Amino acid sequence: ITGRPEWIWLALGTALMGLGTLYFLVKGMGVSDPDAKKFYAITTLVPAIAFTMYLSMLLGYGLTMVPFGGEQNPIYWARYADWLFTTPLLLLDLALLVDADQGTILALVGADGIMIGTGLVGALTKVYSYRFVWWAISTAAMLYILYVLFFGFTSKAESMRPEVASTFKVLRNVTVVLWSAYPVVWLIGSEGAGIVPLNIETLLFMVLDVSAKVGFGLILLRSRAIFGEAE
Amino acid sequence: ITGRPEWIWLALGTALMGLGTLYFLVKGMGVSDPDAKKFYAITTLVPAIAFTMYLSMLLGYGLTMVPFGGEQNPIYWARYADWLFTTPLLLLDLALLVDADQGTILALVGADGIMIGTGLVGALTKVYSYRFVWWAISTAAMLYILYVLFFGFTSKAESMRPEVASTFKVLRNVTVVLWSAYPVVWLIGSEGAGIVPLNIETLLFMVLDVSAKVGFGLILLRSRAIFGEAE
Amino acid sequence: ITGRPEWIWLALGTALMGLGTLYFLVKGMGVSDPDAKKFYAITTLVPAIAFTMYLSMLLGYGLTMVPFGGEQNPIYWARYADWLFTTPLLLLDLALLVDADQGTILALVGADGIMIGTGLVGALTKVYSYRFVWWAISTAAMLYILYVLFFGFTSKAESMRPEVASTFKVLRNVTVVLWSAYPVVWLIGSEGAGIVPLNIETLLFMVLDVSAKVGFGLILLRSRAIFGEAE
Ligand SMILES: CC(C)CCC[C@@H](C)CCC[C@@H](C)CCC[C@@H](C)CCOC[C@@H](CO)OCC[C@H](C)CCC[C@H](C)CCC[C@H](C)CCCC(C)C
Ligand SMILES: CC(C)CCC[C@@H](C)CCC[C@@H](C)CCC[C@@H](C)CCOC[C@@H](CO)OCC[C@H](C)CCC[C@H](C)CCC[C@H](C)CCCC(C)C
Ligand SMILES: CC(C)CCC[C@@H](C)CCC[C@@H](C)CCC[C@@H](C)CCOC[C@@H](CO)OCC[C@H](C)CCC[C@H](C)CCC[C@H](C)CCCC(C)C
Ligand SMILES: *C/C=C(C)/C=C/C=C(C)/C=C/C1=C(C)CCCC1(C)C
Ligand SMILES: *C/C=C(C)/C=C/C=C(C)/C=C/C1=C(C)CCCC1(C)C
Ligand SMILES: *C/C=C(C)/C=C/C=C(C)/C=C/C1=C(C)CCCC1(C)C
Ligand SMILES: CCCCCCCCCCCCCCC
Ligand SMILES: CCCCCCCCCCCCCCC
Ligand SMILES: CCCCCCCCCCCCCCC
Ligand SMILES: CCCCCCCCCCCCCC
Ligand SMILES: CCCCCCCCCCCCCC
Ligand SMILES: CCCCCCCCCCCCCC
Ligand SMILES: CCCCCCCCCCCCC
Ligand SMILES: CCCCCCCCCCCCC
Ligand SMILES: CCCCCCCCCCCCC
Ligand SMILES: CCCCCCCCCCC
Ligand SMILES: CCCCCCCCCCC
Ligand SMILES: CCCCCCCCCCC
Ligand SMILES: CCCCCCCCCCC
Ligand SMILES: CCCCCCCCCC
Ligand SMILES: CCCCCCCCCC
Ligand SMILES: CCCCCCCCCC
Ligand SMILES: CCCCCCCCC
Ligand SMILES: CCCCCCCCC
Ligand SMILES: CCCCCCCCC
Ligand SMILES: CCCCCCCC
Ligand SMILES: CCCCCCCC
Ligand SMILES: CCCCCCCC
Ligand SMILES: CCCCCCCC
Ligand SMILES: CCCCCCCC
Ligand SMILES: CCCCCCCC
Ligand SMILES: CCCCCCCC
Ligand SMILES: CCCCCCCC
Ligand SMILES: CCCCCCCC
């Protein structure tokens, strides 16, 4: 395990996701409100899935070698397995907060699936120049998602409770900033142009992942917006 | 890319799915009705997914070699990845049109999953005679789906709005004819008996795919059946 | 096929799932009640999926070799493909019976996904001692599911119809006993410590699978709890 310099960040990531999972699990024990239960379920599952995939990367299972540029390049494929399930759960948290219509939710989840799926294909593609074609398609799917979060959701939040409108606005802003960093790190890291070494890349993704999951969850689950308006 | 004679049909397929995706995306921009949004979301996602998988076939990612009959046989596995997601979306379009009950929808999607999954296993099976066992099981799942579309849905459409009944009937008929061709092409093509060469097989699937997705979508999204009855 | 001593149990399993599938399919033909249709759909799909995966194991497709302990160890990976889809369907049968809230259903299905997914990783892991780390995480996800079935569902059933409360209690008890045997068989069988040989392991899983699917389904589909209260 320690044979890879990036192991320290995989281990820290595993620990922080594990701790985040346990914290949300305990916190949600005292919850009976049916609406709050939905948000706790979604939000606890996110770091639990990430915990398993960080562990698989730490132990070496979630790593494969991909030939491109005349080299055997270490590619952590387990990231995409994580993201396939956790990024639509994160979007679902946002969509339920603002009572999004079903068509909009399906558009978001579908675009998200395309985003992660094409990122996976790009990560595993052996023809170097083609990796960036997949990156571009994935990034276009991301831009669609960000567009919807701003010009379909923000003006939906404003007709809702003030506490859900303010909580949505904060989580929207956190999401757009954090999620936009992922394609940049991929592009300059070992999957793309290879300018930033894998150990630093792994650190960067770990900070983004913990912030986008445990950070996000801490903000959401401390808000009164997750509860039905009750006396 | 041009090293494979079937590349021209993969390229045309990619282009037509891409163009179809953009057309539906633009067309649905001016839509606020919650019901119509569902149909636009579902129907736009279908060629978008197909676009990505056609591209993966064009670039060579979605192709593998399978030993059977003492030969290395080129198998485009990306078709099944496409179909796994797009065929239940197509069925969902039909089921929502007639306000199908939840049990019926689950039966359809489940049978569809079995249909595509067993087709994939058959496509990748190395014992030649066993490929046709999987083809038979998949075809039985197809026949179940077609049965339900006729003797569970058609008489559901007739108690609904005339515009939804007439639109459903047309899309049902398009679906049954087009979908029934797929097992025949598989059986006589490079996956099955090998009587029709891969380049012609690829052409045939491209015509079926564009018709079943973009053709289907053009009929559906031009109907007033996708809108709630409103003043 | 007969080259593997466990083939007889794979063949019997295939037959019993096939027969169970046909029986439930015929039985549900005379059903119009929308609630009952849901239970028939879910419950018929379960042995149908299991039939396909038992067949893939019989024909040899669903088997791979995994190096650990200095040996090539036969691992039937198709079990996890089965279980990935059938165990959440089984939980859905239980959850719908007691009209579980959406948050609880998502927690169950999510924990179940983690349970099966980590079992799959453990089954395919090449470092022997690490296989048991994945077994432990999977078992913890199982224990969560069993906890919810007892201390979240049982007291939900009691405020419902007596026929649904009594049917739920029986199916809950069947589920907890049968499902708890699976991690034990894995641990002592060819995936784990290797004390029980593969042919006996295969027998054990076949008895558990038929009981947990066809047995379970026979109890559920003969109950009046699956019908809406109607005059
Ligand atoms: C509604 C939304 C969910 C829409 C989803 C959007 C989605 C369509 C976007 C594209 C997804 C698609 C790229 C998934 C591809 C998975 C694939 C990378 C798995 C690895 O297999 C690739 C090659 C080795 O590189 O296998 C070597 C050759 C092997 C023989 C491969 C044969 C097995 C195939 C992988 C079977 C395909 C199954 C499905 C792709 C399962 C989807 C997995 C998940 C990653 C989407
Ligand atoms: C409700 C509905 C959805 C019901 C669904 C119906 C469904 C049950 C029908 C059968 C689906 C099942 C056949 C999927 C099999 C996928 C498999 C072909 C992927 C390729 O792996 C096959 C061999 C190489 O040929 O791998 C070589 C050996 C490797 C070590 C394989 C180990 C990895 C396994 C593939 C893990 C299994 C994961 C699940 C099958 C994911 C499902 C993928 C999708 C195609 C259904
Ligand atoms: C809401 C709930 C559903 C939550 C779900 C919980 C879930 C997160 C729990 C963990 C699931 C995760 C372990 C699935 C891993 C599948 C993996 C074993 C498939 C086989 O690939 C493993 C190695 C060979 O051993 O591939 C060799 C290297 C290859 C290059 C691998 C590259 C292809 C990757 C497999 C692509 C990943 C796609 C997704 C994992 C699809 C999920 C399949 C299913 C088994 C969950
Ligand atoms: C918890 C993990 C999260 C929130 C991950 C988010 C990841 C993305 C938004 C990834 C986006 C990518 C692209 C837009 C193109 C390049 C490849 C990706 C997959 C890194
Ligand atoms: C957009 C793509 C569509 C509508 C594809 C439909 C495909 C089928 C109905 C495929 C059916 C098959 C069988 C019935 C058995 C042989 C294998 C298949 C998968 C080709
Ligand atoms: C129809 C099949 C059923 C009901 C299978 C149930 C399987 C399980 C509950 C498996 C549990 C496992 C663990 C808890 C850890 C070890 C690995 C598994 C996957 C066997
Ligand atoms: C969105 C953030 C992307 C920028 C990442 C900056 C990383 C700077 C680290 C120094 C680069 C290491 C190069 C020498 C090894
Ligand atoms: C459902 C349509 C299946 C029939 C396809 C007919 C294809 C005819 C093309 C000629 C066959 C090529 C054989 C000589 C290369
Ligand atoms: C939950 C049941 C697990 C116990 C399984 C008992 C199997 C006993 C069979 C005898 C073991 C075979 C060892 C000699 C080959
Ligand atoms: C490819 C995996 C996509 C599914 C991820 C799980 C999250 C799905 C959330 C469903 C949202 C509800 C839509 C109506
Ligand atoms: C194996 C992939 C199956 C899922 C495909 C996505 C479409 C699912 C549509 C869900 C229909 C709603 C059922 C209640
Ligand atoms: C990884 C596969 C998980 C999906 C299995 C299919 C069963 C899903 C049942 C959905 C229950 C409804 C939740 C709201
Ligand atoms: C186009 C929608 C406006 C809100 C999205 C902001 C786009 C940020 C760009 C992210 C950088 C990705 C490379
Ligand atoms: C049995 C249901 C009647 C409607 C379905 C028509 C079946 C068409 C056969 C398709 C050919 C597949 C090989
Ligand atoms: C902790 C919840 C109480 C009900 C679950 C009973 C646990 C049975 C243990 C199963 C054995 C697995 C190794
Ligand atoms: C070796 C790099 C070749 C450049 C490929 C860039 C493709 C980016 C596509 C953006 C439309
Ligand atoms: C393919 C990228 C699309 C980003 C711009 C959004 C187009 C308008 C969509 C309106 C729902
Ligand atoms: C080499 C071909 C052997 C014939 C197999 C046909 C099987 C079809 C099954 C239909 C019930
Ligand atoms: C070779 C076996 C080494 C023992 C591993 C047991 C790990 C079990 C983890 C339970 C917390
Ligand atoms: C509760 C702490 C969980 C941390 C387990 C994984 C950390 C890796 C240590 C090497
Ligand atoms: C908008 C046109 C999209 C076409 C891109 C793929 C066509 C392949 C050209 C070689
Ligand atoms: C209807 C009987 C189904 C049995 C088919 C599979 C049994 C395997 C026989 C070798
Ligand atoms: C993006 C950083 C999130 C910070 C989380 C802090 C949570 C405290 C309530
Ligand atoms: C099956 C062929 C479909 C033809 C689509 C034409 C759409 C015009 C409205
Ligand atoms: C766990 C054993 C189940 C027994 C099923 C018998 C069904 C008869 C109604
Ligand atoms: C990591 C366990 C958290 C302890 C409880 C925190 C207050 C709910
Ligand atoms: C008003 C919300 C500001 C949140 C910005 C957080 C940036 C990481
Ligand atoms: C809305 C601001 C987006 C900031 C992008 C930051 C990418 C590192
Ligand atoms: C391909 C872009 C379509 C242009 C608009 C067509 C009329 C909505
Ligand atoms: C009355 C509907 C006829 C549609 C037939 C289309 C055949 C491709
Ligand atoms: C309902 C008519 C079906 C026609 C099947 C055509 C197969 C090529
Ligand atoms: C296996 C076929 C079952 C025959 C009908 C049983 C009574 C519904
Ligand atoms: C009162 C229900 C008892 C069911 C026990 C079944 C054990 C297999
Ligand atoms: C509730 C009793 C569980 C029995 C476990 C049996 C495991 C073989």
Q: What is the CA radius of gyration of chain A?
A: 18
Nearest Cα to C6, choosing from C220, C157, C205, C218?
C205
Report CB contact under 8 Å: A114, B48: yes
Q: What is the identity of the amino acid at C53? A: M
Residue nearest to atom 2 of ligand 27 (CA): A170
Q: Which of B107, B124, B137 sits opposite C52 (nearest CB)?
A: B137
Residue nearest to atom 6 of ligand 28 (CA): A177
Distance (Å, rounded) from C-alpha A143 to C-alpha A145? 5
Strands B63-68 and A71-76: unpaired
Strands C71-76 and A71-76: unpaired
B window 111-170, beta carbon within 8 A of A: none
Distance (Å, rounded) from C-alpha B102 to C-alpha B162? 23
Nearest Cα to C162, choosing from C112, C219, C97?
C97
Structural tokens at position B136: 């038979």
B224 and chain A in contact, CB less than 8 A: no
**Which region holds residue B187: left if phi is over 0, alpha if psi is between -120 and 50, else beta?**
alpha
Task: Tell me, rounded to whole angstroms, the distance of Cα C166 from its chain centroid.
Answer: 22
Range of the domain at C79: 1-231
Nearest Cα to A66, choosing from A78, A76, A57, A74?
A74
Structural tokens at position B122: 């058959």
B211 and chain C in contact, CB less than 8 A: no
Method underlying the structure:
X-ray
Question: How close A45 gets to chain C, by Cα (Å)?
Answer: 7
Stated length of chain B: 231
CB B97 within 8 A of CB B168: yes
Interface mutation target, options A66, A91, A98, A102, chain B, most CBs of B under 10 Å:
A102
A90 lines ligand 10 (CB under 6 A): no
CB A51 within 8 A of CB A168: no
Give the nearest ligand 25 atom to C216 CA: 3
Q: Measured between alpha carbons, how far apart are the two ends of chain B, in Å?
A: 54
Which stretches within B159-222 are classed as H helix?
Answer: 162-188, 198-210, 216-221
Distance (Å, rounded) from C-alpha A76 to C-alpha A187? 15
Nearest Cα to A60, choosing from A119, A127, A14?
A14
Task: List the single residue in C with minimal CA-CA distance to A48.
Answer: C114
CA of A97 to the centre of ligand 29 (A): 33
Residue found by looking up tokens 């023809």 in the block? A127
Residues with Cβ < 8 Å from C17, sequence gap 6 or more?
C47, C48, C50, C51, C54, C209, C210, C213, C214
Report CB contact under 8 Å: A61, C121: yes
Report CB contact under 8 Å: C34, B117: no
Distance (Å, rounded) from C-alpha C221 to C-alpha C44? 10
Number of domains in chain B: 1
The resolution of the experimental structure, rounded to one decimal in Å, is 1.8
Distance (Å, rounded) from C-alpha C45 to C-alpha B214? 31
Task: List the single residue in A with minimal CA-CA distance to C112.
Answer: A45
Residue of B17, B58, B83, B85 with the most ligand 1 atoms within 8 Å of its CB, for mutation: B85
A29 and chain B in contact, CB less than 8 A: no
Residue of B42, B44, B49 with the most ligand 1 atoms within 8 Å of its CB, for mutation: B49
Question: How close A222 gets to chain B, by Cα (Å)?
Answer: 31
CA of B188 to the centre of ligand 8 (A): 8
Task: List the single residue in B with minimal CA-CA distance to A140.
Answer: B48
Task: List the single residue in C with minimal CA-CA distance to A52.
Answer: C118
Q: Which of B37, B52, B59 sits opposite A103 (nearest CB)?
A: B37
Crossing angle of helices B128-151 and B102-124, rounded to 10°: 160
B121 lines ligand 1 (CB under 6 A): no
Task: List the single residue in B with minimal CA-CA distance to C44.
Answer: B107
Task: Tell me, rounded to whole angstroms, the distance of Cα C85 from its chain centroid.
Answer: 9
Cα–Cα distances (Å) from C202 to C86, C115, C182, C207, in that order, read: 18, 20, 11, 9
Residue nearest to atom 10 of ligand 16 (CA): A136
Residue of C2, C10, C14 with the most ligand 22 atoms within 8 Å of its CB, for mutation: C14
Crossing angle of helices A7-27 and A34-59, rounded to 10°: 160
Contacts of A103 in chain B (CB under 8 A): 34, 36-42
Nearest Cα to C211, choosing from C185, C178, C184?
C178
Distance (Å, rounded) from C-alpha C210 to C-alpha C221? 15
Query: What pairs with residue B158 in β-bridges?
Result: none
Cα–Cα distances (Å) from B5 to B71, B186, B201, C196, in that order, read: 19, 19, 11, 53
Read off φ and ψ for residue C6, nearest 5 degrees: -75, 0
Residue nearest to atom 6 of ligand 10 (CA): A85
Residue nearest to atom 4 of ligand 11 (CA): B85
Q: Which of A34, A42, A85 sits opposite C101 (nearest CB)?
A: A34
Interface mutation target, options B22, B39, B43, B45, chain A, most CBs of A under 10 Å:
B45
Could you give the 3-state DSSP secondary structure of residue A64?
strand
**Which region holds residue A70: left if phi is over 0, alpha if psi is between -120 and 50, else beta?**
left
Three-class HEC string of chain C: CCCCCCHHHHHHHHHHHHHHHHHHHHHCCCCCCHHHHHHHHHHHHHHHHHHHHHHHHHHCCCEEEEEECCEEEEEECHHHHHHHHHHHHHHHHHHHHCCCCHHHHHHHHHHHHHHHHHHHHHHHCCCHHHHHHHHHHHHHHHHHHHHHHHHCCHHHHCCCCHHHHHHHHHHHHHHHHHHHHHHHHHHHCCCCCCCCCHHHHHHHHHHHHHHHHHHHHHHHHCCHHHCCCCC
B window 77-106, beta carbon within 8 A of C: 101-104, 106
Distance (Å, rounded) from C-alpha A112 to C-alpha B49? 12
Distance (Å, rounded) from C-alpha B137 to C-alpha B158? 32
> Which ligand ends up closest to the CA of A29?
26
Report CB contact under 8 Å: C114, A41: no
CA of C206 to the centre of ligand 32 (A): 23
CATH code for position C49: 1.20.1070.10
Distance (Å, rounded) from C-alpha C188 to C-alpha A105? 44
Residue found by looking up tokens 């996976």 in the block? A120
Distance (Å, rounded) from C-alpha A210 to C-alpha B143? 48
Question: How close C106 gets to chain A, by Cα (Å)?
Answer: 7
CB C75 within 8 A of CB C65: yes
As to burial, measured by CB atoms within 10 angstroms (0-12 exposed, 13-18 middle, 19+ buried), residue C151 is exposed
C26 and chain B in contact, CB less than 8 A: no
Query: What pairs with residue A65 in β-bridges?
Result: A74
